[model samples]
Every structure is written in C-alpha cells, then in structure tokens.
Target: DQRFGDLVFRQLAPNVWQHTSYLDMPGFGAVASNGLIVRDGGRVLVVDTAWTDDQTAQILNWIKQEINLPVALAVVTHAHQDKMGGMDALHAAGIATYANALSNQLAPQEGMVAAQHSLTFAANGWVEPATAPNFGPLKVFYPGPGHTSDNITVGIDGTDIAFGGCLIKDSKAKSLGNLGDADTEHYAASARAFGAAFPKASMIVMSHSAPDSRAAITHTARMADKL
Candidate 1:
C-alpha cells in the first residue's frame, strides 16, 4: 500500500502504523528494521527510522503525501544507526528530534546525528503528556540495558502498542539480532523490566521483523536467561 521503495507499511492499530525498512549487510542479507508511525489528529509522532537519510526522506515524503499531517516530533530509541540513521533526514525536514540524553550523547559516536532535544529521565520519561499540544501521550522507559546501553521502549499511552526498538526480539528471532553493544548479563532483566513497564502492551513493534505480542518480550528474557 506504500509507494516508498523498500519500505513497507502496515497498520497495527487504529492510529498506529509500522513502517519497516531494510538494510543489506555482509553477514545478514536484507535485514529488516521497523519504526512506529503514531498519529494524533493533525499531527504524527515517529519513532526511529530507516537505515539511511535517503530512505528516511522517502518515509517523510510518504507521510506528507498520504497522512497529510505535519510531523510533530520524532524519537530515537538508541544510538545505533538503525534507530537514528534518519536523524539528518528528520532535521532536514525541519522537524524537532528527541532522544534520551544518553542516546543523544552516544549517537554522534556512531556517526549519527544527535537529536535537538534531550529527554532527561531520572527513572523514566514521557513525551510531553496527554495534555500537551505536541501530539503525544507516549511513555519512554529505560529497562536498564539490553541491545544497547541507551536502548529504551516507547509505549503509546492509551493504545496497546510499544515500540521495543532493538530491545525486544520478534517471536521468530532465534537470537538477539546484534550484540556489538549488548548487555548479555542483564539483558533478561531489562526485557522483563520492559514488560513490567508496559503491562498492557499486546501489540509490540520490534526493531526488526514483524510485530508480536507481550510474549515476545518474555521470549527475549528467556533467551537472555539462558545466557
């Protein structure tokens, strides 16, 4: 249903859609990554992006042409390129970008652009609030450390959707996708913490592969438990 190249879109909930992008690597061919497109009336909030500026720009074009709403803001889940590869694209579109302070600090190290706003969370933070005019009721929570030290999950307030962004694996993923910066020892604990944070999330959008239920979160912990 999308004209975007190599980018697929599917509706997960009434107001939420998952936009998946792909990357071809030496070991992993055509690796898939997904981001969340959450809308609220005249604006939308995007979480994560495609692996390149061009691809991310394609998504932005699609959003403008189809959704016909201006992007209120964008959130980068971690410092990895897959999560923040489109930072420059978002910035080029004149939209404000946000990320946890740690991600903001670590992004440049990964050769990615930093978000304009830093979300400071002593324990956990949220995107504005239900009353804010920024078009969000999203909850941002850090579950210790998993795929990356700065990895976090974004929960859509009233909706049962959570963008697990490289933290939680899909039900079909035999192993955590990448461990270049993983916390194997505490990965399980962090996965469990995510489940606890968004207990109502049944529809979860993983960074890679198809979306799954809360069981995917449990499965991730189970895998971490064995390690």
Candidate 2:
C-alpha cells in the first residue's frame, strides 16, 4: 500500500477512516475526491474508489498502512464516471467491487454513455471495472429507479450506517445539479422506504454530503410526502 499520496485521513469512529481532498491553500479543482473507507471484522470496506490511478493507489497504500486486513469489499454508489472510475485499479488488485444491479448493467450501455465513450479515447479519463464480482446483502426496499435509473443505496446493517449514495446531499448548492439523471418520483419513495427501514441509524453517510441526523431522513420524507 505504498501508493496513496498526501491523503488526509480522519477517523469518524472506531476503525472507520474518512479521506478527503480538502486543502488549506485553495485553488479551484484542487480537491481530490470520490472515495470513502470503513473497517469491520478485521476487513476493510471501501466505498467508491478514487477518480484516478494515483488517488486509487494512495487509498490502497493508506489502507495497507493502517490495517493489515485485505479489502473484503468495494462499493460503488452509482455509475457516474467520477465515482466508479477507479474500479479497474481496485479489482485488478483483487478487491471485490459492487454496484446496484441496474447500475451495473446499464452504466456502460446507457447511464454514463458519454463518459464511458470518453474513457474509450482518453488516456487519463476513466476505465471500466470488472462487473463479475458478487454483491452481498442488497438494501432493497422496493424495486424502482431514481437519481439515475441505476441508483441503489447500500445499507451496511452490521455497521448500522447507511451509505445513502447520491440520494441525500448535505447542502443545497447543487440540489438541482445532482438530480440530473434522477427519477424524482421513485427516488422519493426509495428515500421514504430507507427511512422506515433504518430509522435508528447511528449515522448516515452520503456520496456527496456530511453524515446526517435522523431528522434529515424525516425531512427528506416530508419533502417527498408532497410529491
């Protein structure tokens, strides 16, 4: 794990580490992102691999340094290029990768068509990962599509933490922006279902926001209650 570079790691809880690209000196687009990591039962679980080879390497290296356990699983919240971009590096290194069934099937063919196509030509853009890995327990409440037809939130029951994926955001800045491929109608239903299913989550994390309070889920449901 001698690959991760300058990663600022922080612990949110026991054995759980949060890596970010935040910097003291600011410059537009200097932030390295698209990743998260957790450790359980002597194994490390990484969510959404980094956006580049360097970033991916850095993560792997850091995990090796911190924990000697092998990466038991890798979860990709969605099919967005930025999110799943490092799949190849991770899978090639022997980590199992997963995504919602729909997202995995449609990502290359439909979800990120433009981005997928771009990766085919760009040297450092993106590369597809192996879709052959098995996904463990699915956090299925209902079968529907949203935030992109492939969006599926991963709920780590053992940890009592739900990775809401892109379904929830911290601030309102790009509320509309992240909804680009979202199916507003069903997405709301999924949110409500998640609320009912895991009402007492000790902490809730999202692909693009701070971990939320229980109130956040209620608020999301209230917003969807009208829709």
Candidate 3:
C-alpha cells in the first residue's frame, strides 16, 4: 500500500501484487527490478526477491504488517542476484524458498543464496511446483534458456498474469542487458517458447520494468534474433 524506501508494491491483478526494488549498478546508477506477491486464500507467496537483503526484509515486513498473512511459499525464478539476492532474508524469516535446481546450484556458486527446496527440471516444459503451500495453480516452465541457462517463467494458471522474469524484457528496454551466462544459441528460441507457452498471458510481468503488453515478448525474441 505504501512505499518502502524506493521499493514499492502495486497490485496489477486480483491476486497479483507487483513489487519493485532498486539495484544500484555501476553504469546504470539505481535501476528498478520487479518481483511479485501473489495472495491467495489466507496466505501469500512470492515470485522473487529484491536485489539486497535489506530491501527484501522490508518487503517481508510490509507483507506481514499490511497484508497480515503468512508467507507460505516463495520461488526465485533464477540464480541472478536481482532475482534471489535477498534469499538470506527469506531464510531468516523462516519462509520456505523454492527454486530451479539449476539455479540452486548456480546461486551459491555466484554470490546469491540458493533456495532450500530445489525443483529440478530435466527438459524445457511446463512443471508445477510441489503442492504444499497451494496458493493457486501456477505453471512454472523453463522454456529452453534465454537470460540464463537456469532462467524460467511462472504463469499464474487461470489468470492472464505471467511472470516472464528476465526471459522477456521491458517494452522500453533498449539493450539485451546481461549475457554473462546466457544461452546465446537458444536466446531467441527461449523467448519464442516462453511467448508461445503462454497464449493467455497478455499481462507479461518481467524483472526490469513495468508489466507490459504481449508485444514485449515479440520484441525480446526479435532482439535475440540479432544475437
């Protein structure tokens, strides 16, 4: 409801509330990164975390204070810091963190913390997280690889809401952003698969900018075609 520092949460869908946190970059200064808070039934779940532990703690506190619901589940889309960097905060708050097995392996190897419960996926296709928290139906798929080999998309089943993560960029995004661990060969294909996989997803929520139209998916695919 209110802004926490530069971190802000705004509802974009009935059960989907989008959160934005600022990450200070070398050349980019402070850039906004997006995450999600999905409230279903009597509890809430998180899609990703802020770029830092302090920012993420604020998010957790805000949810606990305003929403007054227990955070039952959380899934970090990938191993990137922008996505899972605040995992320590999640762990400290005793919130179970679920993430891609690949991301769980890559996070600690880089600089981020890994999710405790790792969901390993063999091939790129639709897979739902374990049915414990049971917030709502969510379609989590690793459609090949775009931003990173471990990146994935989380679609809120029965809703137009789609968490494209970093697989799809903001409509206003200029460059391809980071590719330090990207699958260059499958970049375009990954975005294409992510797009095709979610035909009902007109509200594509990405990591960097605001929620966008489906055109952003095509824009990302087109940009990756050049690479």
For model 2, how does the per-residue alpha-carbon lDDT over 77-115 read when each residue is reduced to its tens digit? 667755666667776678766665555666676434211
Candidate 3: tens digits of C-alpha lDDT, residues 77-130:
899878887999999999999888888899878888888887755455655445
- The true-versus-predicted C-alpha distance at residue 194 of model 1, in Å, is 0.5
Q: Which residue pairs in candidate 3 have backbone atoms (N, alpha carbon, C) closer than 3 angstroms, thus clashing?
A: none
What local lDDT score does residue 47 receive in model 2, on the 0 to 100 scale? 74
User: Candidate 3 lDDT (Cα, whole model)?
Assistant: 0.84
lDDT of each: 0.82, 0.57, 0.84
Deviation from native of the Cα of residue 71 in model 1, angstroms: 0.2
Clashes per candidate, residues 3 or more apart or on different chains: 0, 5, 0
Off by over 4 Å in 3: 122-124, 128-135
TM per prediction = 0.92, 0.72, 0.93
TM-score of 2: 0.72
Per-residue alpha-carbon lDDT of model 1 for 165-187, expressed as tens digits? 89899776797878888998989
Q: Pick the candidate with the highest lDDT.
A: 3
What lDDT would candidate 1 get against the real structure? 0.82
